[PDB]
Structures are given as structure tokens and as C-alpha cells.
């Protein structure tokens with residue numbers, strides 16, 4: 001439920017790591033950094049963190065998947081103009 | 087006074103706990119005190135993953151409690167478009183009525199779900215079906231101030247002057 005990381009799969013030369021973030025995390029541009037005992041900080045890469053309408057514990061959670069699609073994933077909108085009767 | 091563990095897993099969309107439970111107890115249609123299966127809970131909260139797990143483990147897609155509320159009824163009432171689709175592909179009956187003779191189209195139109203109403207109509211739902219008081223879906227759409235639902239039902243050739251048992255038109 002907080003920042004965490006765990007190796008789901010591994011071989012001799014690689015680790016498959018599942019990283020979680022808190023449901024109340026600060027959004028924006030992030031840097032992921034690795035610290036190996038007795039070494040200097042190493043930059044692993046950059047990622048951007050956003051709000052999650054798909055997560056039940058997030059403040060922007062939406063009950064419906066159709067509503068999630070319509071109000072977050074659809075780029076084709078309709079602005080209604082004119083008069084009330086037209 | 088607590089729910090069965092499978093109902094709790096269905097509510098939380100916890101497929102790992104549900105898988106462990108179904109490995110231990112192979113019955114996905116376990117009944118709560120109200121008589122609702124975990125598929126009813128999954129349809130209520132639109133938990134797609136646990137619903138697919140339950141249906142793959144043999145849950146009755148057309149389960150009928152004493153009150154006659156099928157999971158399709160709950161999905162149509164709640165506005166769960168994806169759950170309505172999934173239940174329809176798995177064999178959900180389109181004409182089943184509740185204790186008060188409400189079809190899933192009645193539940194969709196009463197709450198003004200245009201997409202769900204169109205999906206049910208495209209699957210053959212009866213647009214002129216009546217409740218115990220003679221209310222058609224257009225009556226329920228007009229009662230809830232659901233303008234687009236009334237428009238869609240009229241587009242599907244619903245009777246604009248259908249009367250209830252009290253001779254009430256949608257007007």
C-alpha cells in the first residue's frame with residue numbers, strides 16, 4: 001500500500017521487480033534510483049505518476065469501467081452549443 | 087453475521103483469495119443470509135476479474151434468489167456496462183422478471199442507462215414488458231427524468247401511449 005518493490009521472477013543475470021506506489025502519492029515527474037550497499041546512487045530511469053480512477057483507494061476512483069473510459073480515456077468529446085430548444 | 091469468505095473476496099475483486107477458496111470449497115454459488123451468490127456482489131461492484139473466475143468455476147449466470155434478482159438485474163440497475171456484456175456472453179437470460187415483474191431493461195431504464203438499455207434491446211429484451219402495476223420501461227424512464235433513455239426507447243418503437251393499471255401514460 002506504500003512504496004515497495006519485490007522480485008517476482010529472476011534468473012542469473014536479471015531481476016523482474018514489481019514496484020508499487022501509494023494511492024495518495026504526489027503526482028508528477030519521478031526519478032527511480034538504485035542504491036547498492038557501498039556504492040553511489042545510480043539513476044535507473046524516469047517515469048511519470050498520475051491519478052488512478054481504476055484504484056479503489058484513490059480519491060478519483062470511478063465505480064464504472066464505462067464511466068472511466070468516457071471521462072478519462074476518450075479523446076473524442078462533444079461540446080454542446082446553441083440554444084436550449086436547439 | 088459476517089458474509090461468507092467468497093462474498094468478501096468478490097467484493098474486493100481478490101482473485102487470489104477467491105482462487106484459494108474455490109480450490110478448498112468448489113462451490114461458487116455459496117449463499118449468504120439474503121440468498122445472493124458472489125456473482126451478485128461482483129455484478130454490483132463491477133469486479134470483472136472475480137466474476138470471470140466465478141463463471142469459469144461454474145457459477146450460475148442465471149441464479150434466481152427468492153426475490154428474483156439475477157446478476158444481470160443488478161448489473162443493469164447499477165450501470166455496469168462491461169458486466170452486462172460479460173453476463174450476456176455467458177448466457178444471461180434477457181426476459182427474467184423479479185418478484186415485482188421487473189426485467190433488466192426495467193432496471194436499466196429506471197436508472198437512465200442508455201448504453202445498457204441499447205445493449206439489452208439489441209439482444210432481444212421485450213420493450214413492452216410490464217411490471218405488476220403495468221409500467222413499461224418507458225414509464226420508468228419518464229419517472230426518473232431520463233431524457234435520453236426516453237429518446238432511445240422511442241427510437242426502438244416503444245409505445246408512446248402505453249398505460250399502466252391506473253391508465254397512466256408516460257405523459
Ligand SMILES: CCCCCCCC(=O)OC[C@H](COP(=O)(O)O[C@@H]1[C@H](O)[C@H](O)[C@@H](OP(=O)(O)O)[C@H](OP(=O)(O)O)[C@H]1O)OC(=O)CCCCCCC
Nearest residue numbers: 005031032033034035036037038039040041042043044045
Ligand atoms: C581502522 C578502520 C578499519 C579498517 C579496516 C576495514 C576493513 C573492512 O571492513 O573492509 C570492508 C569494508 C566494506 O565497507 P563498504 O564499502 O561495504 O561500506 C561503504 C563505506 O563505509 C563507505 O565509506 C560509505 O560511504 P558514506 O560514509 O555513506 O559516504 C558507504 O555508505 P553507504 O553505501 O552505506 O551509503 C558504505 O556502504 O570497508 C571498505 O569499504 C573497504 C576498505 C576500507 C578501508 C580500508 C582501511 C583504510
